[PDB]
């Protein structure tokens, strides 16, 4: 199990790491959230770039990145444009997605980038190599906000992410039943004990899936998503459960 050490956070060891997601529609609103999030205790800051309106301007995007980086200079910073297709806030062409992600990478302002598995294999390969050339780590991601694929399909996707050079494969799926939550946990475990040689993040969405945000140390998810301000768990509550589990 290779691990990813960012700043001094070690992902894939110990208790799962708590990610919070910062959403801002403009520079002022990113800055407001950056100030408010800075009071809070968590492990990784995800900047959800798809909420930012001025995405046509790479310079504006990089100004927003710099504000966040400067607000929390020591926090692992993850740059994420989530496509509408996978539950994001707006549409983007594959060429512009690549422009932003490459600009984030070569800016030096971010520690990790999110890259969607189903962007296209040539574009994903290329972008993984560029990130690695610039010492940025890749969280490769797939989300299904409608339903849960079979255990075997989910494992196939995570394994393809490893094959593509992902530092941290990630998958998030929507339960339609409690059975679906067991399927996601079963997929996580198979990955952990038969395939994973790097950290993997998995989650079952919504109220039904909350247990998957708590059970990561047990079945093999290396990070979880927490809220500063269904399924969303406040970071101090989240950390409480993770410690209690860890020390049992």
Ligand X SMILES: C[C@H]1C(=O)[C@@H](O)[C@H](O)C[C@]1(O)C(=O)O
Q: Strands, E, within the chain: which ranges? A: 4-6, 9-11, 17-22, 44-48, 77-80, 112-116, 137-144, 168-173, 201-204, 223-225
Of the candidates 71, 12, 10, which has an alpha carbon nearest to the alpha carbon of residue 45? 71
> Which of 12, 199, 220, 231 is in the footprint of ligand X by CB under 6 A?
231
Q: What are phi and psi of 22, to 5 degrees?
A: -100, 120
Sort strands 4-6 and 9-11 into parallel, antiparallel or unpaired: antiparallel
Ligand-binding annotation for 107, yes or no, is no
Sort strands 17-22 and 223-225 into parallel, antiparallel or unpaired: parallel
15 touching a second copy, by CB under 8 A: no
Binding mask 207-226 for a second copy (x = CB under 8 A): xx-xx--xx--xx-------
147 touching a second copy, by CB under 8 A: no
What is the size of the binding site for ligand X (CB under 6 A)?
Answer: 9
What minimum distance in Å lies between the beta carbon of 239 and a second copy?
11
Decide which of a second copy, ligand X, none touches 18; Cβ closer than 5 to 8 Å per partner kind. Answer: none
The 8-class DSSP code of residue 234 comes to: B
Residue with smaller CB distance to ligand X, 46 or 111: 46
Stretch that binds a second copy, among 36-44, 63-71, 157-165, 234-242 (CB under 8 A): 234-242
* Cross-strand partners of 224: 18
Ligand-binding annotation for 213, yes or no, is yes
Residue 14 DSSP SS3: coil
Please confirm, yes or no, whether 96 is among the known catalytic residues. Answer: no
Site for ligand X in 189-228 (CB under 6 A): 203, 205, 225
83 touching ligand X, by CB under 6 A: no
Residue with smaller CB distance to ligand X, 85 or 129: 85
Nearest-5° Cα angle at 202, 228 to 111: 60
Please confirm, yes or no, whether 143 is among the known catalytic residues. Answer: yes
Ligand-binding annotation for 46, yes or no, is yes
Distance (Å, whole) CA 210 – CA 161: 24
Sheet with strand 201-204: strands edge to edge: 201-204, 168-173, 137-144, 112-116, 77-80, 44-48, 17-22, 223-225
Distance (Å, whole) CA 57 – CA 5: 31
> Which of 117, 166, 168, 172 is in the footprint of ligand X by CB under 6 A?
172
Q: Choose the catalytic residue: 2, 96, 170, 229.
A: 170
* Binding stretches for a second copy (CB under 8 A): 178-179, 181-182, 185-186, 189, 192-193, 207-208, 210-211, 214-215, 218-219, 230-233, 237, 240-241, 244-245, 248
Q: Binding site membership: which residues?
A: 21, 46-48, 82, 213, 232
* Binding stretches for ligand X (CB under 6 A): 21, 46, 48, 172, 203, 205, 225, 231-232
Q: Binding site membership for 3-dehydroquinate: which residues?
A: 21, 46-48, 82, 213, 232
């Amino acid at each position: 199990m290779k691990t990813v050490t960012v700043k001094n956070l070690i992902i894939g060891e110990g208790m799962p790491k708590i990610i919070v997601s910062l959403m801002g529609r403009d520079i002022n609103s990113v800055k407001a959230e950056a100030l408010a999030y800075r009071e809070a205790t968590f492990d990784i800051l995800e900047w959800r770039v798809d909420h930012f309106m001025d995405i046509a301007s790479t310079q504006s995007v990089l100004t927003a990145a710099r504000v966040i980086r400067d607000a929390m200079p020591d926090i692992p910073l993850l740059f994420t444009f989530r496509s509408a297709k996978e539950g994001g806030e707006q549409t983007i062409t594959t060429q512009h997605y690549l422009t932003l992600n490459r600009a984030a990478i070569d800016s030096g302002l971010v520690d990790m980038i999110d890259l969607e598995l189903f962007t296209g294999d040539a574009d994903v390969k290329a972008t993984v190599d560029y990130a690695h050339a610039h010492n940025v780590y890749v969280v490769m991601s797939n989300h299904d906000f409608h339903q849960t694929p079979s255990a075997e399909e989910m494992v196939l996707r995570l394994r393809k992410m490893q094959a593509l050079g992902a530092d941290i494969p990630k998958i998030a799926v929507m339960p339609q039943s409690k059975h679906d939550v067991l399927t996601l946990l079963t997929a996580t475990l198979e990955m952990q004990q038969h395939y994973a040689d790097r950290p993997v993040i998995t989650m079952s969405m919504a109220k039904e899936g909350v247990i998957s945000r708590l059970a990561g140390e047990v079945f093999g998810s290396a990070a979880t998503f927490g809220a500063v301000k269904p399924g969303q768990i406040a970071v101090n509550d989240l950390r409480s459960v993770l410690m209690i589990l860890h020390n049992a």
